[PDB]
């Protein structure tokens, strides 16, 4: 059998329940993370399911500390629980060691938490991937955390339905700039590959959200991209795909 | 085994059941008025499986 729980195991190395949980994330919203020189620029495809909706009033981007963007896909309640947990961890680090939590340190703690639920059958595994990064004292970093409890450094990452389109152009983005690119320019490139990853979601319509934490613009604080800058990104992406 | 229009009504059947009104819909409705089926372009039903 070996698929009833998550501490059944198989000779095949599979754990089933966890692999199943990734399917929720793979049918989640498109979300990207671009490692830039000065920071990171996150962008997330926000589906517009109806005209009844209030635009830019529902977010999947919650800030952790004042300098860590976190944007996630899969089951929204479950991911909001994981981010809720990591707001406590950031507060705990700040209490004990009197510093805003470093991005590699933050990744370590979250990985432990997600590990715990795949080691016990009396609690349910998580089924979300979060993409989080920011600017700390060791530089800018970018991490994506799998619901398995695995993370790595990333020069680009993506998740959701339109991850195929995004990743393919992120390869080209690192081939445009093998010496890395500005956070400011990466706004317009984040727009472009959400638009191309909306060709996997072209039975649907979308709202473009972009958020950044970069030293150059926002001074190492995580803020949202809005107003004329946001509209410039939209206009950029529009002409490229035309 | 074969009979010929035996005298039984809904009065003599104890209760009215949903399964009786599904029989009415197969049997009576196309016999009485195959007209309405035709104008609609729905096929008239003539097949019923009774199980219980």
């Amino acid at each position: 059998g070996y698929d009833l729980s998550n501490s059944v195991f198989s000779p095949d190395g599979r754990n089933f329940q966890v692999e199943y949980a990734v399917k929720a994330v793979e049918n989640g919203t498109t979300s990207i993370g671009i490692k830039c020189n000065d920071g990171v620029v996150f962008a997330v495809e926000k589906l517009i399911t109806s005209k009844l909706l209030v635009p830019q009033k529902n977010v999947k981007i919650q800030v952790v500390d004042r300098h860590i963007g976190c944007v996630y896909s899969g089951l929204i309640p479950d991911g909001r629980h994981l981010v809720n947990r990591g707001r406590e961890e950031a507060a705990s680090f700040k209490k004990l060691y009197k510093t805003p939590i470093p991005i590699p340190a933050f990744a370590d703690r979250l990985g432990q938490y997600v590990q715990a639920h795949t080691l016990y059958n009396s609690v349910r595994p998580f089924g979300v991937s979060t993409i989080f990064g920011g600017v700390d004292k060791n530089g800018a970093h970018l991490y994506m955390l799998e619901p398995s409890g695995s993370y790595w450094g990333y020069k680009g990452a993506a998740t959701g339905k339109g991850r195929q389109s995004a990743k393919a152009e992120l390869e080209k983005l690192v081939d445009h700039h093998p010496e890395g690119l500005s956070a400011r320019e990466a706004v317009k490139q984040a727009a472009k590959i959400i638009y191309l990853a909306h060709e996997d979601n072209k039975e649907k319509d979308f709202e473009l959200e972009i958020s950044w934490c970069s030293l150059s613009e926002t001074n190492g604080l995580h803020k949202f991209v809005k107003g004329d800058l946001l509209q410039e990104a939209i206009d950029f992406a529009q002409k490229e795909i035309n | 085994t074969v009979e010929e229009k035996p005298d039984v009504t809904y009065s003599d059947v104890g209760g009215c059941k949903d399964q009786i009104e599904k029989l009415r819909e197969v049997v009576e409705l196309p016999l009485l008025s195959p007209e309405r089926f035709a104008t609609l372009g729905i096929d008239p039903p003539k097949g019923i499986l009774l199980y219980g």
Binding site: E203 | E25, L29, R36, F37, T39, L40, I42
Partner: protein
């Protein structure tokens, strides 16, 4: 095929391994129309409208709506099947026919 042993599934057993997903929103509308094409077809009905309200419906589920729309039409004593009837036909295949109150109202 996840149940089934993967030895039987390999190349030359079976070559191409082809998934059949549910119909999507737009696909639902095409499957509804052909069912409706069989009966009287009218400008009242919009198949897209019916496709957006149905959710997670395959041709077997979609077919039950269409036929069922034409029995309300039959009882009403209509000669042309109207849009509303299809809309009413959706809710009988669903989990409700319930207007009950006990503890789940």
């Amino acid at each position: 095929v996840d149940v089934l042993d993967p030895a039987l599934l390999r190349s030359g057993r079976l070559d191409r391994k082809i998934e059949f997903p549910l119909p999507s929103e737009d696909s639902r509308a095409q499957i509804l129309q052909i069912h409706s094409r069989k009966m009287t077809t009218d400008d009242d009905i919009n198949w897209q409208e019916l496709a957006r309200s149905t959710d997670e419906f395959n041709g077997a589920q979609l077919k039950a709506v269409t036929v069922e729309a034409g029995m309300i039409a039959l009882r009403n004593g209509q000669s042309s099947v109207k849009h509303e009837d299809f809309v009413e036909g959706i809710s009988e295949v669903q989990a409700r026919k319930s207007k009950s109150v006990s503890f789940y109202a």
